[model samples]
Target: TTALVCDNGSGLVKAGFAGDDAPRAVFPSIVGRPRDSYVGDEAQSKRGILTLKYPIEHGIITNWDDMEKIWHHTFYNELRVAPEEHPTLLTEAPLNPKANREKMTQIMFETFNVPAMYVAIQAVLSLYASGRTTGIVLDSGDGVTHNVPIYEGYALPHAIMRLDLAGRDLTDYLMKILTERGYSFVTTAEREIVRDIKEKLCYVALDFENEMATAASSSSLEKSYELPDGQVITIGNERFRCPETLFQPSFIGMESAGIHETTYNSIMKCDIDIRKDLYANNVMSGGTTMYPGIADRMQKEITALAPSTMKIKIIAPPERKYSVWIGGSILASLSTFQQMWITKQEYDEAGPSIVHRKCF
Candidate 1:
C-alpha cells in the first residue's frame, strides 16, 4: 500500500505520496487571517493586514486546534487524498517530547482517519535518505537548528546539538543592517522582504579574514538589490558578513559557539569510538544549508577544529530541504517497513498511547 509522506517543519509543510522522488505539496506552516484564514503563500501575501499565527515552534505543536485545520488544508487543497485510504508517514524533531507524540497520534488517526501511521524523527529519516545510517546531520532551517548524530538506525540521544541561530535570525539581522541603510521598517512584511533577499544574495565565505579585507578594500563589493516594489538598496561586506553569523554567531553579538564548533562539540560528546565516523560523514540538510560556499566552509572549519588527522566530509543533497520527506517516502514504500505502521485498529486497541511503544 502506498503511504503519504509529510515532513512538517516549523517553517514549511511538505507532503506527497510515498515512493515518489519528490514531494507534491509544499507550503509554509503559518496560518493567517484578516477576517478570512489563509495558509502558506496566500498568507504570505497581505502581511500588513493579516494576523500571522504559527501553530508550531521549536518542534512542538503549540496549538493543535489551528494545526488540525492546517492538516485539513493540506489534505484538501493540497494532496486531495482520501485520508482513510492512505497510511501517513510524518516526521518530527529528533527529540520531540512524549505528550507531543500522543497528541500527534491522536490527531492523525482519531481526526484524520489515517489507516496506518508512523511518526518518526526528522534527523534519522534525513540520514536514511542519504543511503547511510551512520552520519552527522546539521540541519538549520527557519526556526530551529539541530546537529543530530545517528548511528546505524538510532541516534546518540545525549549528543544532539541545538543551535539557537536560524534563517529567521539572519533575516532579522539583515533587517537591522538595512534599517541603518535607510529601509525604514514599517510592517510584518519587511522581514519577509529581507528573508527573500537573504535567500537570493547571501553566501558563506570560505576565508573569513581575507574576505573581510576583500570586502573592505573596494567598492565592487557593494551592489544594489531591488525588492518587489522596485526600491533598491546597496551595502558592502554585509552580504557575506550576514551569513557569517552561522560560523560566527558573535557577528550578531551572540555568545553561542559557531555551527562548526557546535557540531564538533556534539561529536566529542558521543562515544570516542564513533567520533572518527561522525567526522568522516556529515550530511547538510535544510534550506539554510543551500548557500553556495557552505559545504566547503564547514569542511574547512570543522577540519581545523578536529584532530588534523581526522577525515572530514560533508554531503548535501541537491534537494536537501525535503530529505526528511524523501526518506519517509523510501521507508514507507518498502515491504519491510509496512509492519512498523500503527494501524487504525491498534489506535482503538490502546488509544493515542499506542504511539509510544511502536514508533519510539
Candidate 2:
C-alpha cells in the first residue's frame, strides 16, 4: 500500500489503503471505556460497562487524548504498517481552529511517529476524488449542516454556511416529540434505535402545505410506516405533521437555518450567479444524508428555492456510507495529489504556513 487514508467525521471514522476493496473499517466516532482496552460498539448496542466518548463533536477535535487512542488503535495500530511503506492523509474539518491544527500536527509527528502527513478538509477532498474543480458539498453530519462551496478543489472560505441544526438536534427533536407523545427516548441510551426509526420512517414532503391539508381531511389512511416489530406510526389522520424543521429550521424554535436553503445561500454567496455551473456538481455526503429520501428531497427542495432558469442536481456516491473513505483512498494514491501535499520537506523548508499557502 502506498498510502493510508483516514476520514473522521462527527459520527464515524473511515480508514483504508488506497485502491482497496472498501474501507477496511467503518465505526461510529465513539469509544467506550477509558483505560486498558476499549471496545467499539461493534454490535452497536447501548449496553456496555464502558463510558462513551465522542472524538469529534461540533465538527472539531475537542477530545484529543481519547481521540488519539481511538485513531491509533483502530486505524494506525490495527494496520501495524511500517512507516516507510506508506504516507498518510488525514481529513479534518474545514476552517478548523488554529490550536487544533497545531495539536493535530504535533500528534502525527510526535505521538504516531508518522513520517508524512497531509491534512485536507473533508469537503475539499471529495472534490479532488471526483476530479471537479468547482462544486458544492452538502455535508450534514452529527453536529451541524455544512454547505461548502469548492472551486478548483478548494473550499471558498467565505462561501461556507453552517446551521447548528443537524443530526443530533434532529434526534433531540425526535426525542422531544416522542416524549410529548409519552414515550421515553434517550439519545445515548437509544441512539441506534432512534436513528433506525429516523432512517426507515423519515420523508421530506415537497408540498408540505398540501400534505398537511390532505392529512387534515380526516381519512383513516393517515399515511403510516411499519416499525421493525411490525407496529405502525401515523403522522396525522386529518392533517399531516410537518418535519419542516429538518429542512427549514426557521419553522422550529431554533435559530439555525436549513440544509436546502443553506446550500443555495452558500452558492449565492460566491461571486458567481446562481446559474453558474458550480452547483451542477453538488455532492451530498455525511451520515444524516444517508437517509433514504434525503438526496431526492434535497434536490427537489433546493431546486424549488432557486431560480427556474437554474437546475439543481444532488449527487451521492454509489455507497453513501463509505464515500468518505473511498474519496480519501483515491486522493491518497494519486501521484498528482502530491503537488498539493505539505510533506515534511515542504514544511521544513517553509513553516506551517505551508497549509494556508497550499489551499488543498
Candidate 3:
C-alpha cells in the first residue's frame, strides 16, 4: 500500500509499489505550465508548453523543487493514508554525489513527512532481478553508460567503467547524418520519430565490416523509410548500421574505441577465475536493449574476445520493460532483505551511510 520506488528519469518518473510487478505510474519528470507547476500525461499534451524543468542532469537529480513536487504527487495522489507510512525503498544512480543524496534524504524527511526511507542503486536492484550471484551489468540509459561489475551480488569498484556515450548521443548522431543529407529532421517532432526508429531498428553490431558490406550493396537494400511527415529517405546499405557505434566508435566520428574490447580489458583486470565466471553471467537491460539482434551481437562479440574455453550466457527477462522493477520486487521478497531496509530509528540515528553498504 506504500509507494516504494521512484525511477526519476530526466524525461519520465517510473514510480510504483515496492513489491509490485511494474511501475504504478510512469509520469514525466519535467514540470512546467502557465499558472502553476504541471505533471503527468494530460499536462504534457499541450503544444508550446513553457517552463519545462528536470531535476536530473545526466541521471542525477539537480532540480529539487520541481522533482519534489513530482515525487509528492506520485505518493499522495493515490488517496491513501494521511501521512502515515513506514519505511520506503527508493532507487538512485550508482555513485550518486553525497550532496545529492543529502538533498534527497532531507526532502523526503522534511517536506514529505516521511519518517524513514532506504535508498539503493538501480544497477544492484537490476542484478537482484537477474538472479545472478556474479555478472557484468551494462546499464546503458538515456545519456550515459555505467558498466557495473557485480561479483556475488556486490559491485567491484575498480571493475566499473563509465562511458559518455548513450541513447541521446546516438540520437544526436542520427540527427547529424539526417541534417547532412539535407533532411529536416532535428526539430521536436522529428526527434520523437527518430527515437522510435532507433529503438525498433537498432541492434548491437558484431561484424561491422561484414555487415557494412551487405548494407552497401544496393540489391539487399529495402524500400527507404518514409516519415509520417512525408519525407522519403533511403537508409544506407551499411552492415554496421545503428548499433555499430557500440563496437566501432569511429563510425560516429567518436574517438576510436570498442565497447566489447573495453569490456574485455575491464574483465582482465579481475581475477582470472572470476573473470571466467563473469563471462558466463552477462546481463543487459534498459530500453535500448530491446533493439533486435542486441543479445546475439553482445554474445558473439564477447565470445570472440573471451577465452575459447570460457562459457557465455545472456539472460533475458520475460518482460524487459519491468525487469529492473522485477529485480526490486524479487529483492524485497527475500527475508534477509528486510534487515537491509532502514528502520525509522536507524535512518534518524545513522543517515545516508546506511545506503552505501546496503545498496551494494
Candidate 4:
C-alpha cells in the first residue's frame, strides 16, 4: 500500500508519497486564514496581501487549526491524494511531549480517518537516510540546533542537547547587520530577501581569527548582493560573522554549547561502547548546516575535542537541506516499517495512547 511521508519542519514542510527520493511538495509551514484559508505556496504568495499564521513554532505543532489546514491542503491540493487511500509516516522532533503526539494520533484517526500512521523521530530518520542506525545526529534547522545521540535506531531523549540557534538565528543576525549598514527590511518579503543573501553570501570560517584578519585588509571577503528591487549592498565580514554563531553562540547572547561542543557532549553522554561508532558516523542534517566549510570546520572543532589518538568523522548528506524528508521517504518505503504502523483498529482499542505504545 502507498503511504504519505511528511517532515513537518518549523520553517518548511516536506511532503510526498513513499518510494520517492525527494519530496514532491516543499512549502512554508504556515497557513493564512484571511477571508479564505490558504496554505503552502498559496499562503506564501499572499505574504504582503495577507497576514499568515504559522502552525509550527520551535519545531512543534502549536496551532492545530493551521496545522490541520496545512495537512488537508498538502493531501488534497498538493499531493492530490485522499487520506483514506494510504497510511502516513510523519517526522517528529526529539523529546516531543506525549500529549502532543497523542493529539496528532487522534487527528489522523478521528479527523482524517486514515487507515494507519507512524511517527518517527526526525533525528532517527536522518540517520536512517544516511543508511546508518547508530550515530550522533546534529540537526541545525530553522528553529533549533539539536544534537541527538542514537543507538540501534533508538534516540536517547535524555541526552538530546538543543540550542536556540539555527537558520532563522543567522537570518536575524544578518538583518541586524543589514540594519546597521542602512538597509531597511520591514516586510516579510523583504526579510526573505535578507535570507537569500545569507544563503548566497555566507560561509562558515574555518579559522575565525584568520578570517577576521583577512576581513580587516582584503576585499575578497566582500561581495555585492542585489535585492529584488535592484538595490545593491556590499556584504563583508557580516557574511561569515552571522554564521559564526553556529561555532560560537556567544556571538549572539545565548548561553549554550556551540555545535561542535554539543556534538562532543552528546557522544560523551552515551555509553562509552558506542562513542566510537557515534563519532565515526556522525551525521549532520538541516538547512543551517548547508553553509560552506561547515562540515570541515565542525570536523576540525570536534577533532580537537576528541582524544589525540582518536579519529573523528562527520557525515553531511548530499541533500543536507532536505535530509529529514529524505529520511522519512526512506523509512516509509521500508518493508519492516509496514507492520510498525498503528492501525485504526489498534487505535480504537487503546485510544491515542496506542501511539506511544506502538510507534516509538
Best by lDDT: 4
Q: Which 10 successive residues of model 1 have the least lDDT summed?
A: 184-193
State every prediction's TM-score relative to the real structure. Answer: 0.96, 0.85, 0.87, 0.98
Better of 1 and 4 by TM-score: 4
lDDT per residue for candidate 2 within 208-313, as digits (tens), equals 7765666667564355656555656554521112345667676558766677878888888997653367668888867667765567777787778877877677
> Between candidates 2 and 3, which one is better according to lDDT?
2
lDDT of 1 by residue, 87-140 (tens): 999888877888899999999898889999999888888888999889899988
Give every collision pair in model 1: none
Q: How many residue pairs in model 2 have overlapping backbones?
A: 7
Best by TM-score, which number? 4
Query: Could you list the CA RMSD of all candidates, in the order they appear?
Result: 1.6, 3.5, 2.9, 1.1
Among all windows of ten consecutive residues in candidate 4, which has the lowest summed lDDT? 42-51
Off by over 4 Å in 4: none
Q: Lowest summed-lDDT stretch of 10 residues in model 2?
A: 234-243
- lDDT of each model, Cα atoms only? 0.87, 0.69, 0.67, 0.88
Sort by TM-score, best first: what order? 4, 1, 3, 2
